[PDB]
Short mmCIF file of all heavy atoms in Angstrom, two decimals:
data_model
loop_
_atom_site.label_atom_id
_atom_site.label_comp_id
_atom_site.label_asym_id
_atom_site.label_seq_id
_atom_site.Cartn_x
_atom_site.Cartn_y
_atom_site.Cartn_z
N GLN I 130 -57.29 51.25 113.84
CA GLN I 130 -57.49 52.70 114.09
C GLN I 130 -58.19 53.34 112.84
O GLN I 130 -59.28 53.85 112.95
CB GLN I 130 -56.27 53.40 114.46
CG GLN I 130 -56.42 54.93 114.61
CD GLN I 130 -56.34 55.64 113.31
OE1 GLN I 130 -55.32 55.57 112.60
NE2 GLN I 130 -57.45 56.39 112.96
N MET I 131 -57.45 53.34 111.75
CA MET I 131 -57.90 53.96 110.48
C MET I 131 -59.31 53.43 109.96
O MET I 131 -60.18 54.20 109.67
CB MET I 131 -56.89 53.73 109.32
CG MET I 131 -55.44 53.92 109.77
SD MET I 131 -54.36 52.69 108.98
CE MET I 131 -55.54 52.01 107.73
N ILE I 132 -59.41 52.08 109.94
CA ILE I 132 -60.67 51.48 109.42
C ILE I 132 -61.87 52.29 109.78
O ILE I 132 -62.31 53.05 108.95
CB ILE I 132 -60.85 49.97 109.99
CG1 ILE I 132 -59.69 49.14 109.54
CG2 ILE I 132 -62.17 49.40 109.54
CD1 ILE I 132 -59.64 48.65 108.09
N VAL I 133 -62.41 52.18 111.03
CA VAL I 133 -63.60 53.00 111.41
C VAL I 133 -63.53 54.41 110.75
O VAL I 133 -64.65 54.98 110.41
CB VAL I 133 -63.71 53.08 113.00
CG1 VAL I 133 -62.91 54.17 113.54
CG2 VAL I 133 -65.16 53.19 113.38
N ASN I 134 -62.34 54.99 110.60
CA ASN I 134 -62.30 56.27 110.01
C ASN I 134 -62.65 56.23 108.55
O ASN I 134 -63.47 57.08 108.01
CB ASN I 134 -60.85 56.85 110.08
CG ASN I 134 -60.61 57.63 111.43
OD1 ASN I 134 -61.54 57.84 112.18
ND2 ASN I 134 -59.39 58.06 111.59
N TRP I 135 -62.24 55.19 107.81
CA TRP I 135 -62.65 55.05 106.47
C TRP I 135 -64.12 54.74 106.24
O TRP I 135 -64.79 55.23 105.35
CB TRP I 135 -61.78 53.90 105.75
CG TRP I 135 -62.26 53.50 104.42
CD1 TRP I 135 -61.96 54.18 103.29
CD2 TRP I 135 -63.00 52.35 104.04
NE1 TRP I 135 -62.64 53.53 102.20
CE2 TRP I 135 -63.24 52.33 102.72
CE3 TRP I 135 -63.58 51.29 104.85
CZ2 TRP I 135 -63.91 51.40 102.02
CZ3 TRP I 135 -64.34 50.37 104.21
CH2 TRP I 135 -64.46 50.37 102.74
N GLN I 136 -64.71 53.96 107.17
CA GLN I 136 -66.09 53.69 107.16
C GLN I 136 -66.90 54.99 107.41
O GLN I 136 -67.88 55.22 106.77
CB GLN I 136 -66.48 52.55 108.11
CG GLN I 136 -66.48 51.21 107.60
CD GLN I 136 -67.75 50.86 106.79
OE1 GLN I 136 -68.05 51.59 105.82
NE2 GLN I 136 -68.41 49.85 107.12
N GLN I 137 -66.49 55.83 108.32
CA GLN I 137 -67.17 57.06 108.63
C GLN I 137 -67.08 58.00 107.45
O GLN I 137 -67.94 58.70 107.10
CB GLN I 137 -66.66 57.65 109.95
CG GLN I 137 -65.41 58.59 109.88
CD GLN I 137 -65.65 59.99 109.26
OE1 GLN I 137 -66.75 60.30 108.83
NE2 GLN I 137 -64.58 60.78 109.21
N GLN I 138 -65.88 57.99 106.84
CA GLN I 138 -65.71 58.80 105.50
C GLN I 138 -66.69 58.26 104.50
O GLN I 138 -67.23 59.08 103.78
CB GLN I 138 -64.28 58.73 105.06
CG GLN I 138 -63.96 59.78 104.11
CD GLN I 138 -62.77 60.63 104.52
OE1 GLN I 138 -62.87 61.41 105.48
NE2 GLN I 138 -61.69 60.60 103.73
N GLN I 139 -66.82 56.95 104.36
CA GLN I 139 -67.81 56.37 103.41
C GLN I 139 -69.23 56.86 103.74
O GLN I 139 -69.86 57.30 102.77
CB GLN I 139 -67.72 54.82 103.46
CG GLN I 139 -68.02 54.19 102.22
CD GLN I 139 -66.78 53.74 101.41
OE1 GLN I 139 -65.73 54.31 101.59
NE2 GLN I 139 -66.85 52.70 100.64
N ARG I 140 -69.58 56.76 105.00
CA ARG I 140 -70.96 57.27 105.33
C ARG I 140 -71.06 58.74 105.08
O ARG I 140 -72.12 59.12 104.55
CB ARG I 140 -71.11 56.97 106.90
CG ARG I 140 -72.50 56.66 107.33
CD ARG I 140 -73.19 55.61 106.36
NE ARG I 140 -72.41 54.57 105.98
CZ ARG I 140 -72.00 53.45 106.62
NH1 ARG I 140 -72.46 53.34 107.86
NH2 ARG I 140 -71.28 52.63 106.12
N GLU I 141 -70.04 59.57 105.40
CA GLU I 141 -70.27 60.99 105.19
C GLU I 141 -70.25 61.40 103.72
O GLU I 141 -71.08 62.27 103.33
CB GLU I 141 -69.00 61.64 105.83
CG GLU I 141 -68.83 63.07 105.46
CD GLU I 141 -68.35 64.02 106.57
OE1 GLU I 141 -67.09 63.84 106.96
OE2 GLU I 141 -69.10 64.81 107.12
N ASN I 142 -69.45 60.69 102.81
CA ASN I 142 -69.49 61.12 101.40
C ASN I 142 -70.74 60.57 100.78
O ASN I 142 -71.27 61.15 99.85
CB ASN I 142 -68.24 60.58 100.66
CG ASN I 142 -68.02 59.03 100.88
OD1 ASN I 142 -68.89 58.26 100.42
ND2 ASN I 142 -66.95 58.73 101.43
N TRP I 143 -71.26 59.42 101.25
CA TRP I 143 -72.53 58.93 100.74
C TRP I 143 -73.64 59.94 101.10
O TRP I 143 -74.53 60.24 100.27
CB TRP I 143 -72.91 57.46 101.32
CG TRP I 143 -74.34 57.21 101.30
CD1 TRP I 143 -75.11 57.13 100.11
CD2 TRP I 143 -75.25 56.88 102.34
NE1 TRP I 143 -76.40 56.82 100.49
CE2 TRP I 143 -76.46 56.75 101.83
CE3 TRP I 143 -75.07 56.84 103.78
CZ2 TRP I 143 -77.63 56.37 102.57
CZ3 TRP I 143 -76.09 56.57 104.58
CH2 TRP I 143 -77.41 56.27 104.00
N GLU I 144 -73.66 60.41 102.41
CA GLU I 144 -74.67 61.46 102.77
C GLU I 144 -74.46 62.69 101.92
O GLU I 144 -75.52 63.31 101.53
CB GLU I 144 -74.46 61.78 104.25
CG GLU I 144 -74.88 60.58 105.15
CD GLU I 144 -76.40 60.42 105.24
OE1 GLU I 144 -77.16 61.30 104.74
OE2 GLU I 144 -76.81 59.39 105.78
N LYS I 145 -73.27 63.11 101.68
CA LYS I 145 -73.00 64.30 100.87
C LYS I 145 -73.53 64.06 99.43
O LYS I 145 -74.18 65.06 98.88
CB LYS I 145 -71.53 64.58 100.83
CG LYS I 145 -71.12 65.83 100.05
CD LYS I 145 -69.82 65.71 99.37
CE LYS I 145 -69.02 67.03 99.37
NZ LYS I 145 -67.68 66.89 98.66
N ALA I 146 -73.33 62.95 98.85
CA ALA I 146 -73.81 62.67 97.54
C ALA I 146 -75.32 62.68 97.44
O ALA I 146 -75.96 63.24 96.57
CB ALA I 146 -73.27 61.33 96.95
N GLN I 147 -75.97 62.06 98.48
CA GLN I 147 -77.42 62.10 98.53
C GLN I 147 -77.98 63.38 98.74
O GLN I 147 -78.99 63.77 98.17
CB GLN I 147 -77.97 61.14 99.62
CG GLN I 147 -77.86 59.62 99.21
CD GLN I 147 -79.05 58.81 99.82
OE1 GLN I 147 -79.58 59.18 100.79
NE2 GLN I 147 -79.41 57.78 99.14
N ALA I 148 -77.31 64.22 99.52
CA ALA I 148 -77.73 65.66 99.78
C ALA I 148 -77.59 66.42 98.45
O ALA I 148 -78.48 67.25 98.11
CB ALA I 148 -76.93 66.32 100.87
N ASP I 149 -76.57 66.19 97.67
CA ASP I 149 -76.42 66.89 96.42
C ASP I 149 -77.55 66.45 95.42
O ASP I 149 -78.15 67.26 94.74
CB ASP I 149 -75.06 66.57 95.81
CG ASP I 149 -74.71 67.52 94.58
OD1 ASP I 149 -75.14 68.64 94.68
OD2 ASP I 149 -73.93 67.08 93.68
N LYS I 150 -77.88 65.16 95.45
CA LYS I 150 -79.01 64.66 94.70
C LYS I 150 -80.35 65.28 95.09
O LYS I 150 -81.13 65.70 94.18
CB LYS I 150 -79.12 63.13 94.67
CG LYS I 150 -77.90 62.41 94.09
CD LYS I 150 -78.15 60.96 94.08
CE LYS I 150 -79.09 60.49 92.95
NZ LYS I 150 -78.36 59.96 91.84
N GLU I 151 -80.52 65.48 96.38
CA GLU I 151 -81.79 66.06 96.89
C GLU I 151 -81.82 67.51 96.46
O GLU I 151 -82.91 68.05 96.09
CB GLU I 151 -81.89 65.85 98.35
CG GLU I 151 -81.92 64.40 98.82
CD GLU I 151 -83.18 63.69 98.34
OE1 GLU I 151 -84.32 63.98 98.93
OE2 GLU I 151 -83.09 62.91 97.43
N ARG I 152 -80.69 68.18 96.49
CA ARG I 152 -80.67 69.57 96.12
C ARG I 152 -81.06 69.70 94.64
O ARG I 152 -81.81 70.59 94.28
CB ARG I 152 -79.29 70.15 96.44
CG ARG I 152 -79.03 71.57 95.81
CD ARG I 152 -80.08 72.54 96.23
NE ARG I 152 -80.04 72.80 97.75
CZ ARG I 152 -80.99 72.59 98.59
NH1 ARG I 152 -82.23 72.12 98.19
NH2 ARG I 152 -80.82 72.89 99.85
N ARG I 153 -80.40 68.89 93.83
CA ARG I 153 -80.65 68.93 92.40
C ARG I 153 -82.11 68.67 92.03
O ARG I 153 -82.75 69.34 91.19
CB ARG I 153 -79.74 67.96 91.66
CG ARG I 153 -78.46 68.55 91.11
CD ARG I 153 -77.47 67.54 90.65
NE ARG I 153 -76.53 68.05 89.66
CZ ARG I 153 -75.37 68.69 89.92
NH1 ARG I 153 -75.16 68.97 91.27
NH2 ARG I 153 -74.65 69.09 89.00
N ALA I 154 -82.68 67.63 92.71
CA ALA I 154 -84.07 67.30 92.44
C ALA I 154 -84.98 68.35 93.07
O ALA I 154 -86.16 68.46 92.60
CB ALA I 154 -84.42 66.00 92.97
N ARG I 155 -84.60 69.03 94.17
CA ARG I 155 -85.44 70.03 94.73
C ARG I 155 -85.48 71.29 93.86
O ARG I 155 -86.58 71.90 93.59
CB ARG I 155 -84.94 70.40 96.11
CG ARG I 155 -86.02 70.84 97.15
CD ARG I 155 -86.93 69.73 97.48
NE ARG I 155 -87.79 70.04 98.57
CZ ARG I 155 -88.98 69.42 98.79
NH1 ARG I 155 -89.37 68.40 98.10
NH2 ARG I 155 -89.73 69.84 99.79
N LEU I 156 -84.38 71.78 93.34
CA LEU I 156 -84.36 73.02 92.55
C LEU I 156 -85.13 72.92 91.17
O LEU I 156 -85.25 73.97 90.64
CB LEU I 156 -82.91 73.47 92.38
CG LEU I 156 -82.43 74.58 93.36
CD1 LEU I 156 -80.98 75.10 92.85
CD2 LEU I 156 -83.50 75.65 93.35
N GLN I 157 -85.45 71.76 90.78
CA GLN I 157 -86.15 71.58 89.51
C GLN I 157 -87.65 71.35 89.69
O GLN I 157 -88.34 70.85 88.73
CB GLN I 157 -85.59 70.47 88.68
CG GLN I 157 -84.09 70.42 88.60
CD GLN I 157 -83.61 70.00 87.29
OE1 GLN I 157 -82.59 70.42 86.76
NE2 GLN I 157 -84.23 68.95 86.71
N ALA I 158 -88.19 71.80 90.89
CA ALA I 158 -89.67 71.56 91.09
C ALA I 158 -90.43 72.74 90.40
O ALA I 158 -91.52 72.56 89.97
CB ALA I 158 -89.91 71.50 92.59
N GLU I 159 -89.86 73.92 90.56
CA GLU I 159 -90.55 75.15 89.86
C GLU I 159 -90.22 75.13 88.42
O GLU I 159 -89.12 75.66 87.99
CB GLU I 159 -90.08 76.41 90.54
N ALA I 160 -91.06 74.52 87.62
CA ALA I 160 -90.89 74.46 86.16
C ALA I 160 -92.16 74.48 85.44
O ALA I 160 -93.21 74.01 86.04
CB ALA I 160 -90.03 73.20 85.75
N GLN I 161 -92.23 74.96 84.23
CA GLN I 161 -93.43 75.12 83.46
C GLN I 161 -93.50 74.08 82.33
O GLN I 161 -94.48 73.30 82.31
CB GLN I 161 -93.58 76.51 82.90
N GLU I 162 -92.51 74.06 81.49
CA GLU I 162 -92.54 73.20 80.28
C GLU I 162 -91.16 73.35 79.60
O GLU I 162 -90.50 74.34 79.65
CB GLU I 162 -93.59 73.51 79.28
N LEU I 163 -90.75 72.28 78.96
CA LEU I 163 -91.35 70.94 78.84
C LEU I 163 -90.44 69.86 79.43
O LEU I 163 -90.79 69.02 80.18
CB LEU I 163 -91.86 70.65 77.47
N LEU I 164 -89.21 69.88 78.84
CA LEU I 164 -88.21 68.90 79.19
C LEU I 164 -87.05 69.69 79.83
O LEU I 164 -87.09 70.83 80.20
CB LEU I 164 -87.69 68.16 77.87
N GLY I 165 -85.90 68.90 80.05
CA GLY I 165 -84.78 69.45 80.75
C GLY I 165 -83.82 70.19 79.83
O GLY I 165 -82.63 70.06 79.95
N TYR I 166 -84.37 70.92 78.96
CA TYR I 166 -83.60 71.74 77.99
C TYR I 166 -83.47 73.20 78.51
O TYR I 166 -82.40 73.85 78.22
CB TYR I 166 -84.19 71.77 76.64
N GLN I 167 -84.45 73.73 79.23
CA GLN I 167 -84.40 75.09 79.77
C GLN I 167 -84.64 75.13 81.19
O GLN I 167 -83.94 75.91 82.00
CB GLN I 167 -85.46 76.00 79.08
N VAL I 168 -85.58 74.33 81.74
CA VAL I 168 -85.78 74.27 83.17
C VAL I 168 -84.52 73.66 83.86
O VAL I 168 -84.04 74.17 84.95
CB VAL I 168 -86.96 73.34 83.51
#
């Protein structure tokens, strides 16, 4: 019973982590210069 539940939790948290990564990489597109010190 639990197994499939743990696999679905694995899938969901992996999707959540990838969504967080996509959000982080999206919000840094509007930048002028130069490195990740101010942008």
Side-chain angles (χ1 to χ4, degrees), residues 130-158 160 165:
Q130 176 275 302
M131 319 143 7
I132 301 286
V133 86
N134 271 358
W135 170 81
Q136 268 281 55
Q137 87 70 3
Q138 196 124 296
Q139 213 98 332
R140 214 44 40 81
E141 164 147 75
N142 56 63
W143 159 63
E144 292 285 347
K145 182 213 216 182
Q147 281 214 336
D149 197 29
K150 296 187 75 106
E151 299 296 285
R152 170 56 66 240
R153 263 167 157 83
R155 212 66 174 158
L156 259 189
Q157 313 214 144

